[PDB]
Short mmCIF file of all heavy atoms in Angstrom, two decimals:
data_model
loop_
_atom_site.label_atom_id
_atom_site.label_comp_id
_atom_site.label_asym_id
_atom_site.label_seq_id
_atom_site.Cartn_x
_atom_site.Cartn_y
_atom_site.Cartn_z
N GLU A 113 -5.27 -8.02 -1.69
CA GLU A 113 -5.06 -8.57 -0.37
C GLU A 113 -4.49 -9.97 -0.39
O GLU A 113 -4.43 -10.64 0.69
CB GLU A 113 -6.37 -8.49 0.42
CG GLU A 113 -7.61 -8.90 -0.27
CD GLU A 113 -8.75 -9.08 0.71
OE1 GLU A 113 -8.69 -10.04 1.51
OE2 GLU A 113 -9.74 -8.31 0.70
N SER A 119 7.50 -9.34 1.91
CA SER A 119 8.03 -7.99 1.72
C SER A 119 7.91 -7.35 0.31
O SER A 119 7.42 -6.18 0.20
CB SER A 119 9.48 -7.89 2.28
OG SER A 119 10.50 -7.93 1.29
N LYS A 120 8.33 -8.08 -0.74
CA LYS A 120 8.39 -7.54 -2.12
C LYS A 120 7.02 -7.35 -2.76
O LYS A 120 6.20 -8.27 -2.81
CB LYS A 120 9.23 -8.46 -3.00
CG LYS A 120 9.54 -7.95 -4.41
CD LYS A 120 10.07 -9.07 -5.31
CE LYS A 120 10.25 -8.55 -6.74
NZ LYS A 120 11.38 -9.24 -7.37
N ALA A 121 6.76 -6.16 -3.27
CA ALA A 121 5.46 -5.82 -3.89
C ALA A 121 5.22 -6.58 -5.24
O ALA A 121 6.07 -6.54 -6.14
CB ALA A 121 5.40 -4.27 -4.13
N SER A 128 8.13 -5.44 -14.60
CA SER A 128 9.07 -6.06 -15.57
C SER A 128 8.35 -6.87 -16.70
O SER A 128 8.57 -6.63 -17.88
CB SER A 128 10.27 -6.76 -14.88
OG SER A 128 10.16 -8.15 -14.82
N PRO A 134 11.91 2.18 -16.93
CA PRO A 134 12.48 1.89 -15.59
C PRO A 134 12.27 2.98 -14.55
O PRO A 134 12.13 2.64 -13.38
CB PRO A 134 13.99 1.65 -15.90
CG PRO A 134 14.23 2.53 -17.08
CD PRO A 134 12.97 2.29 -17.95
N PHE A 135 12.26 4.26 -14.92
CA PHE A 135 12.06 5.33 -13.90
C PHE A 135 10.63 5.55 -13.36
O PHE A 135 9.96 6.54 -13.64
CB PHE A 135 12.75 6.61 -14.36
CG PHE A 135 14.20 6.41 -14.46
CD1 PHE A 135 14.80 6.10 -15.68
CD2 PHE A 135 14.96 6.37 -13.31
CE1 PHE A 135 16.21 5.88 -15.76
CE2 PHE A 135 16.32 6.14 -13.37
CZ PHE A 135 16.96 5.89 -14.60
N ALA A 136 10.18 4.50 -12.70
CA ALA A 136 8.82 4.46 -12.15
C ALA A 136 8.92 3.94 -10.68
O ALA A 136 9.79 3.18 -10.28
CB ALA A 136 7.98 3.40 -12.99
N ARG A 137 7.94 4.35 -9.90
CA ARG A 137 7.61 3.83 -8.59
C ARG A 137 6.66 2.64 -8.81
O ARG A 137 5.78 2.74 -9.61
CB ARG A 137 6.75 4.82 -7.81
CG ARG A 137 7.42 5.95 -7.19
CD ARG A 137 6.40 6.91 -6.50
NE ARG A 137 7.16 8.04 -5.97
CZ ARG A 137 7.23 9.27 -6.48
NH1 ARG A 137 6.62 9.61 -7.61
NH2 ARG A 137 7.95 10.16 -5.85
N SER A 138 6.90 1.56 -8.11
CA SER A 138 6.08 0.31 -8.05
C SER A 138 5.86 -0.09 -6.60
O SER A 138 6.84 -0.24 -5.82
CB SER A 138 6.79 -0.84 -8.84
OG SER A 138 7.04 -0.42 -10.18
N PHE A 139 4.59 -0.33 -6.18
CA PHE A 139 4.40 -0.77 -4.85
C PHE A 139 2.97 -1.29 -4.78
O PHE A 139 2.18 -1.22 -5.75
CB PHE A 139 4.52 0.39 -3.78
CG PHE A 139 3.77 1.60 -4.18
CD1 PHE A 139 2.45 1.80 -3.74
CD2 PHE A 139 4.30 2.53 -5.03
CE1 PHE A 139 1.69 2.94 -4.29
CE2 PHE A 139 3.58 3.64 -5.56
CZ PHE A 139 2.27 3.91 -5.16
N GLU A 140 2.71 -1.90 -3.64
CA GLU A 140 1.44 -2.40 -3.32
C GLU A 140 0.65 -1.48 -2.37
O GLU A 140 1.21 -0.73 -1.50
CB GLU A 140 1.56 -3.80 -2.66
CG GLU A 140 1.59 -4.91 -3.57
CD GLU A 140 1.63 -6.31 -2.84
OE1 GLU A 140 1.02 -6.48 -1.74
OE2 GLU A 140 2.28 -7.22 -3.40
N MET A 141 -0.61 -1.53 -2.53
CA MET A 141 -1.48 -0.95 -1.48
C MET A 141 -2.49 -1.96 -0.85
O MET A 141 -3.07 -2.83 -1.55
CB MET A 141 -2.19 0.28 -1.99
CG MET A 141 -1.23 1.39 -2.38
SD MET A 141 -2.15 2.80 -3.18
CE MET A 141 -2.62 3.88 -1.81
N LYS A 142 -2.67 -1.90 0.45
CA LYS A 142 -3.43 -2.91 1.16
C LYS A 142 -4.40 -2.36 2.19
O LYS A 142 -4.05 -1.56 3.01
CB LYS A 142 -2.50 -3.93 1.83
CG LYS A 142 -3.22 -5.06 2.49
CD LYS A 142 -2.74 -5.47 3.90
CE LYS A 142 -1.32 -5.93 3.95
NZ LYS A 142 -0.84 -6.44 5.29
N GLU A 143 -5.64 -2.79 2.07
CA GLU A 143 -6.68 -2.59 3.05
C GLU A 143 -7.92 -3.35 2.58
O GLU A 143 -8.84 -2.79 2.06
CB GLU A 143 -7.00 -1.13 3.32
CG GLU A 143 -8.28 -0.79 4.06
CD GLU A 143 -8.88 -1.87 4.96
OE1 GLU A 143 -8.15 -2.53 5.67
OE2 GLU A 143 -10.08 -2.03 4.95
N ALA A 144 -7.87 -4.64 2.77
CA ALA A 144 -8.98 -5.52 2.34
C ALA A 144 -9.50 -5.15 0.92
O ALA A 144 -8.67 -5.06 0.01
CB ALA A 144 -10.13 -5.53 3.40
N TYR A 146 -10.94 -2.48 -0.10
CA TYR A 146 -10.87 -1.02 -0.36
C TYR A 146 -9.67 -0.43 -1.22
O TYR A 146 -9.87 0.62 -1.90
CB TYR A 146 -10.84 -0.29 1.01
CG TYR A 146 -10.52 1.19 0.86
CD1 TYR A 146 -11.46 2.09 0.32
CD2 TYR A 146 -9.31 1.71 1.31
CE1 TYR A 146 -11.17 3.42 0.10
CE2 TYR A 146 -9.01 3.05 1.14
CZ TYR A 146 -9.90 3.90 0.51
OH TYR A 146 -9.48 5.20 0.33
N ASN A 153 -7.02 7.26 -6.32
CA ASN A 153 -6.85 8.64 -5.86
C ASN A 153 -5.38 9.16 -5.97
O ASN A 153 -5.17 10.29 -6.46
CB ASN A 153 -7.48 8.78 -4.48
CG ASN A 153 -7.47 10.20 -4.00
OD1 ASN A 153 -6.64 10.57 -3.21
ND2 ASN A 153 -8.30 11.03 -4.61
N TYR A 154 -4.40 8.39 -5.49
CA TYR A 154 -3.05 8.73 -5.60
C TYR A 154 -2.72 8.90 -7.07
O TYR A 154 -1.99 9.88 -7.42
CB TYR A 154 -2.12 7.71 -4.89
CG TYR A 154 -0.65 7.97 -4.86
CD1 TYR A 154 -0.11 9.22 -5.11
CD2 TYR A 154 0.22 6.92 -4.54
CE1 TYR A 154 1.25 9.40 -5.12
CE2 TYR A 154 1.57 7.08 -4.49
CZ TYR A 154 2.08 8.35 -4.78
OH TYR A 154 3.50 8.54 -4.77
N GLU A 160 -2.40 14.82 -12.03
CA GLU A 160 -2.60 16.29 -11.90
C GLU A 160 -1.30 17.06 -11.77
O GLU A 160 -1.08 18.12 -12.39
CB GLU A 160 -3.36 16.61 -10.65
CG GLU A 160 -4.85 16.66 -10.74
CD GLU A 160 -5.40 17.92 -10.05
OE1 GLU A 160 -5.04 19.02 -10.44
OE2 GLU A 160 -6.23 17.83 -9.14
N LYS A 161 -0.43 16.55 -10.91
CA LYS A 161 0.75 17.24 -10.55
C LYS A 161 1.74 17.13 -11.68
O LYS A 161 2.45 18.09 -11.92
CB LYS A 161 1.28 16.65 -9.23
CG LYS A 161 2.51 17.33 -8.63
CD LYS A 161 2.37 18.85 -8.44
CE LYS A 161 3.67 19.31 -7.88
NZ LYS A 161 3.45 20.58 -7.28
N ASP A 207 -12.91 15.74 -8.04
CA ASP A 207 -12.19 16.04 -6.83
C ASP A 207 -12.94 15.75 -5.56
O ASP A 207 -12.34 15.58 -4.50
CB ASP A 207 -11.78 17.51 -6.83
CG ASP A 207 -10.91 17.86 -7.97
OD1 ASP A 207 -10.42 16.94 -8.68
OD2 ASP A 207 -10.70 19.06 -8.16
N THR A 209 -14.35 13.61 -2.91
CA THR A 209 -14.42 12.22 -2.46
C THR A 209 -14.59 12.28 -0.95
O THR A 209 -14.21 13.31 -0.35
CB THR A 209 -13.13 11.44 -2.78
OG1 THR A 209 -12.07 11.93 -1.93
CG2 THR A 209 -12.75 11.67 -4.19
N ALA A 211 -13.97 9.62 2.37
CA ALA A 211 -13.67 8.29 2.99
C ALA A 211 -14.00 8.23 4.47
O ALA A 211 -13.98 9.24 5.11
CB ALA A 211 -12.18 7.94 2.78
N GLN A 212 -14.23 7.06 4.99
CA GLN A 212 -14.53 6.88 6.41
C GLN A 212 -13.74 5.65 6.94
O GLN A 212 -13.66 4.61 6.28
CB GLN A 212 -16.06 6.75 6.68
CG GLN A 212 -16.37 6.86 8.17
CD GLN A 212 -17.86 6.65 8.52
OE1 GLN A 212 -18.70 6.48 7.64
NE2 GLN A 212 -18.16 6.64 9.78
N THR A 213 -13.13 5.77 8.13
CA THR A 213 -12.51 4.59 8.75
C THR A 213 -13.21 4.35 10.08
O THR A 213 -13.38 5.31 10.83
CB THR A 213 -10.97 4.82 9.07
OG1 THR A 213 -10.26 5.07 7.85
CG2 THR A 213 -10.40 3.58 9.72
N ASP A 215 -12.79 1.31 12.97
CA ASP A 215 -12.16 0.04 13.43
C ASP A 215 -13.28 -0.82 14.00
O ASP A 215 -13.93 -0.44 14.99
CB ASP A 215 -11.05 0.32 14.48
CG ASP A 215 -10.28 -0.97 14.93
OD1 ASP A 215 -10.27 -2.01 14.28
OD2 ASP A 215 -9.62 -0.94 16.00
N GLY A 344 -12.82 -4.23 7.99
CA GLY A 344 -11.91 -3.63 8.96
C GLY A 344 -12.29 -2.42 9.80
O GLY A 344 -11.95 -2.43 11.01
N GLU A 348 -15.26 4.55 0.89
CA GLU A 348 -15.11 5.83 0.24
C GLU A 348 -16.17 5.97 -0.86
O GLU A 348 -16.45 5.01 -1.58
CB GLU A 348 -13.71 5.96 -0.34
CG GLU A 348 -13.58 7.23 -1.12
CD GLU A 348 -12.15 7.44 -1.55
OE1 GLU A 348 -11.27 6.92 -0.83
OE2 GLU A 348 -11.89 8.13 -2.56
N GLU B 113 6.53 -3.76 6.17
CA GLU B 113 6.52 -5.07 5.56
C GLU B 113 6.23 -6.18 6.54
O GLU B 113 6.37 -7.39 6.17
CB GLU B 113 7.85 -5.29 4.82
CG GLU B 113 9.09 -4.91 5.52
CD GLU B 113 10.31 -5.46 4.83
OE1 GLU B 113 10.49 -6.71 4.86
OE2 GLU B 113 11.13 -4.72 4.26
N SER B 119 -5.48 -9.46 5.25
CA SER B 119 -6.27 -8.45 4.53
C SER B 119 -6.36 -7.04 5.16
O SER B 119 -6.12 -6.02 4.44
CB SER B 119 -7.67 -9.01 4.16
OG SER B 119 -8.73 -8.59 5.00
N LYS B 120 -6.71 -6.96 6.46
CA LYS B 120 -6.97 -5.66 7.14
C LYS B 120 -5.71 -4.85 7.40
O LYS B 120 -4.74 -5.34 7.99
CB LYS B 120 -7.69 -5.91 8.47
CG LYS B 120 -8.19 -4.67 9.21
CD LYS B 120 -8.57 -4.99 10.66
CE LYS B 120 -8.93 -3.71 11.40
NZ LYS B 120 -9.96 -4.01 12.41
N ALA B 121 -5.71 -3.60 6.98
CA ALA B 121 -4.55 -2.70 7.14
C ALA B 121 -4.27 -2.32 8.63
O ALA B 121 -5.17 -1.85 9.34
CB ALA B 121 -4.79 -1.40 6.29
N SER B 128 -7.99 4.13 15.10
CA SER B 128 -8.86 4.14 16.30
C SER B 128 -8.09 4.42 17.63
O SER B 128 -8.43 5.34 18.37
CB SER B 128 -9.87 2.95 16.33
OG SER B 128 -9.49 1.92 17.19
N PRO B 134 -13.27 10.52 12.10
CA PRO B 134 -13.68 9.33 11.32
C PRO B 134 -13.61 9.47 9.81
O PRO B 134 -13.32 8.48 9.15
CB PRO B 134 -15.14 9.07 11.82
CG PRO B 134 -15.62 10.45 12.14
CD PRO B 134 -14.41 11.07 12.86
N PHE B 135 -13.86 10.65 9.24
CA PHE B 135 -13.80 10.80 7.76
C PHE B 135 -12.39 10.87 7.12
O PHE B 135 -11.94 11.90 6.62
CB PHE B 135 -14.74 11.90 7.31
CG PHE B 135 -16.13 11.56 7.62
CD1 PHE B 135 -16.75 12.03 8.78
CD2 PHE B 135 -16.78 10.63 6.84
CE1 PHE B 135 -18.09 11.66 9.09
CE2 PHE B 135 -18.08 10.25 7.13
CZ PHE B 135 -18.74 10.76 8.27
N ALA B 136 -11.71 9.75 7.28
CA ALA B 136 -10.33 9.61 6.80
C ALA B 136 -10.23 8.25 6.04
O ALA B 136 -10.91 7.26 6.30
CB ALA B 136 -9.37 9.55 8.06
N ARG B 137 -9.29 8.22 5.12
CA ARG B 137 -8.77 7.04 4.46
C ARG B 137 -7.63 6.49 5.33
O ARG B 137 -6.85 7.25 5.81
CB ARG B 137 -8.06 7.41 3.16
CG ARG B 137 -8.89 7.70 1.99
CD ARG B 137 -8.01 8.13 0.77
NE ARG B 137 -8.93 8.47 -0.31
CZ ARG B 137 -9.26 9.69 -0.73
NH1 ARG B 137 -8.81 10.79 -0.16
NH2 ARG B 137 -10.10 9.79 -1.74
N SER B 138 -7.62 5.20 5.53
CA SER B 138 -6.59 4.40 6.26
C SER B 138 -6.19 3.19 5.42
O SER B 138 -7.07 2.39 5.00
CB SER B 138 -7.12 3.94 7.66
OG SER B 138 -7.54 5.08 8.40
N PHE B 139 -4.88 2.98 5.17
CA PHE B 139 -4.51 1.82 4.45
C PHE B 139 -3.01 1.66 4.64
O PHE B 139 -2.31 2.49 5.27
CB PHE B 139 -4.77 1.94 2.90
CG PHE B 139 -4.29 3.22 2.35
CD1 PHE B 139 -3.00 3.32 1.79
CD2 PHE B 139 -5.04 4.36 2.41
CE1 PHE B 139 -2.50 4.66 1.40
CE2 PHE B 139 -4.58 5.65 2.03
CZ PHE B 139 -3.32 5.83 1.45
N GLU B 140 -2.56 0.50 4.17
CA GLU B 140 -1.20 0.17 4.17
C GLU B 140 -0.53 0.36 2.79
O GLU B 140 -1.15 0.23 1.69
CB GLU B 140 -1.01 -1.31 4.61
CG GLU B 140 -0.90 -1.53 6.02
CD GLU B 140 -0.63 -3.03 6.40
OE1 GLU B 140 0.09 -3.77 5.65
OE2 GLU B 140 -1.13 -3.46 7.46
N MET B 141 0.71 0.66 2.85
CA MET B 141 1.52 0.56 1.63
C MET B 141 2.75 -0.41 1.75
O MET B 141 3.43 -0.48 2.81
CB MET B 141 1.96 1.92 1.15
CG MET B 141 0.78 2.81 0.78
SD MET B 141 1.37 4.54 0.38
CE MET B 141 1.72 4.51 -1.38
N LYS B 142 3.00 -1.19 0.72
CA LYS B 142 3.99 -2.25 0.81
C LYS B 142 4.91 -2.34 -0.40
O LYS B 142 4.47 -2.37 -1.51
CB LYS B 142 3.31 -3.61 1.04
CG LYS B 142 4.27 -4.73 1.24
CD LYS B 142 3.98 -6.05 0.48
CE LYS B 142 2.67 -6.68 0.85
NZ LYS B 142 2.39 -8.02 0.21
N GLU B 143 6.19 -2.35 -0.12
CA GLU B 143 7.24 -2.66 -1.06
C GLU B 143 8.56 -2.67 -0.29
O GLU B 143 9.33 -1.75 -0.33
CB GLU B 143 7.31 -1.71 -2.24
CG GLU B 143 8.55 -1.71 -3.11
CD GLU B 143 9.40 -2.98 -3.11
OE1 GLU B 143 8.86 -4.07 -3.16
OE2 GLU B 143 10.61 -2.86 -3.09
N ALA B 144 8.77 -3.75 0.42
CA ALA B 144 9.99 -3.90 1.25
C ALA B 144 10.33 -2.60 2.03
O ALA B 144 9.44 -2.09 2.71
CB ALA B 144 11.19 -4.40 0.37
N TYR B 146 11.17 0.28 0.94
CA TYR B 146 10.82 1.51 0.18
C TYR B 146 9.47 2.28 0.52
O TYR B 146 9.42 3.54 0.32
CB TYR B 146 10.75 1.14 -1.33
CG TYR B 146 10.15 2.26 -2.17
CD1 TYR B 146 10.87 3.44 -2.42
CD2 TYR B 146 8.90 2.11 -2.77
CE1 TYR B 146 10.32 4.50 -3.11
CE2 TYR B 146 8.34 3.15 -3.50
CZ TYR B 146 9.01 4.35 -3.65
OH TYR B 146 8.35 5.33 -4.34
N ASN B 153 5.08 10.75 -0.54
CA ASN B 153 4.70 11.43 -1.78
C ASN B 153 3.15 11.62 -1.94
O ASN B 153 2.70 12.71 -2.29
CB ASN B 153 5.38 10.75 -2.95
CG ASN B 153 5.14 11.46 -4.24
OD1 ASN B 153 4.32 11.05 -5.02
ND2 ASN B 153 5.76 12.63 -4.39
N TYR B 154 2.37 10.55 -1.72
CA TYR B 154 0.97 10.62 -1.76
C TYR B 154 0.51 11.65 -0.75
O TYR B 154 -0.41 12.46 -1.08
CB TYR B 154 0.30 9.24 -1.56
CG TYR B 154 -1.19 9.13 -1.64
CD1 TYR B 154 -1.96 10.11 -2.25
CD2 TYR B 154 -1.82 8.00 -1.13
CE1 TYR B 154 -3.33 10.00 -2.26
CE2 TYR B 154 -3.17 7.83 -1.19
CZ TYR B 154 -3.92 8.85 -1.76
OH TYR B 154 -5.36 8.72 -1.80
N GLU B 160 -1.25 19.18 -0.91
CA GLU B 160 -1.32 20.20 -1.99
C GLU B 160 -2.72 20.44 -2.49
O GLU B 160 -3.18 21.58 -2.72
CB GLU B 160 -0.54 19.75 -3.19
CG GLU B 160 0.90 20.13 -3.26
CD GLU B 160 1.26 20.69 -4.64
OE1 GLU B 160 0.67 21.69 -5.05
OE2 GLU B 160 2.15 20.18 -5.33
N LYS B 161 -3.42 19.34 -2.74
CA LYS B 161 -4.68 19.38 -3.38
C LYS B 161 -5.71 19.87 -2.40
O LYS B 161 -6.60 20.59 -2.79
CB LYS B 161 -4.99 17.98 -3.95
CG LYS B 161 -6.29 17.86 -4.76
CD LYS B 161 -6.41 18.86 -5.91
CE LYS B 161 -7.74 18.59 -6.55
NZ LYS B 161 -7.72 19.16 -7.85
N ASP B 207 9.16 19.18 -5.24
CA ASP B 207 8.48 18.46 -6.30
C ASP B 207 9.37 17.55 -7.11
O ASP B 207 8.88 16.62 -7.75
CB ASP B 207 7.81 19.45 -7.24
CG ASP B 207 6.81 20.30 -6.55
OD1 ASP B 207 6.45 20.01 -5.38
OD2 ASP B 207 6.37 21.26 -7.19
N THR B 209 11.33 14.51 -7.79
CA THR B 209 11.69 13.21 -7.22
C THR B 209 11.95 12.29 -8.40
O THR B 209 11.43 12.58 -9.50
CB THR B 209 10.55 12.61 -6.37
OG1 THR B 209 9.48 12.21 -7.26
CG2 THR B 209 10.03 13.65 -5.44
N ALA B 211 12.07 8.05 -9.09
CA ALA B 211 12.07 6.62 -8.66
C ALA B 211 12.50 5.67 -9.76
O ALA B 211 12.35 5.97 -10.90
CB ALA B 211 10.66 6.22 -8.17
N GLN B 212 12.99 4.50 -9.39
CA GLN B 212 13.42 3.50 -10.36
C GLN B 212 12.91 2.10 -9.89
O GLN B 212 12.98 1.77 -8.70
CB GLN B 212 14.96 3.51 -10.58
CG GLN B 212 15.35 2.67 -11.80
CD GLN B 212 16.87 2.56 -12.03
OE1 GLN B 212 17.67 3.17 -11.31
NE2 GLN B 212 17.25 1.78 -12.99
N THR B 213 12.37 1.29 -10.82
CA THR B 213 12.03 -0.09 -10.47
C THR B 213 12.85 -1.00 -11.35
O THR B 213 12.89 -0.77 -12.56
CB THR B 213 10.50 -0.41 -10.74
OG1 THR B 213 9.67 0.44 -9.94
CG2 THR B 213 10.21 -1.85 -10.38
N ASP B 215 13.20 -5.21 -11.48
CA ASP B 215 12.86 -6.55 -10.95
C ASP B 215 14.16 -7.35 -10.89
O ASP B 215 14.79 -7.60 -11.93
CB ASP B 215 11.80 -7.25 -11.84
CG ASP B 215 11.31 -8.63 -11.28
OD1 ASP B 215 11.45 -8.96 -10.10
OD2 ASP B 215 10.73 -9.44 -12.05
N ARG B 253 18.38 14.96 -14.76
CA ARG B 253 17.05 15.58 -14.94
C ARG B 253 16.76 16.87 -14.21
O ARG B 253 15.93 17.66 -14.67
CB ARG B 253 15.90 14.62 -14.58
CG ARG B 253 15.94 13.32 -15.28
CD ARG B 253 14.62 12.58 -15.07
NE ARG B 253 14.68 11.27 -15.72
CZ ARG B 253 13.61 10.50 -15.91
NH1 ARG B 253 12.43 10.92 -15.47
NH2 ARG B 253 13.73 9.32 -16.48
N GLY B 344 13.92 -5.97 -4.11
CA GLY B 344 12.98 -6.33 -5.17
C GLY B 344 13.19 -5.94 -6.62
O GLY B 344 12.94 -6.80 -7.50
N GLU B 348 14.18 5.57 -4.74
CA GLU B 348 13.75 6.90 -5.08
C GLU B 348 14.67 7.93 -4.43
O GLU B 348 15.08 7.75 -3.28
CB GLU B 348 12.31 7.12 -4.64
CG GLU B 348 11.89 8.53 -4.88
CD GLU B 348 10.42 8.70 -4.59
OE1 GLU B 348 9.70 7.69 -4.73
OE2 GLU B 348 9.96 9.82 -4.27
#
Side-chain angles (χ1 to χ4, degrees):
Chain A
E113 45 167 291
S119 102
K120 188 194 175 148
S128 103
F135 297 97
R137 281 177 183 104
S138 304
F139 46 94
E140 272 183 34
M141 298 173 89
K142 185 225 299 185
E143 166 23 42
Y146 170 72
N153 186 259
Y154 183 18
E160 270 227 60
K161 184 53 181 199
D207 300 349
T209 70
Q212 192 184 356
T213 299
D215 184 19
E348 175 173 333
Chain B
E113 45 167 291
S119 102
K120 188 194 175 148
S128 103
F135 297 97
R137 281 177 183 104
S138 304
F139 46 94
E140 272 183 34
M141 298 173 89
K142 185 225 299 185
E143 166 23 42
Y146 170 72
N153 186 259
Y154 183 18
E160 270 227 60
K161 184 53 181 199
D207 300 349
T209 70
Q212 192 184 356
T213 299
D215 184 19
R253 306 192 182 192
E348 175 173 333

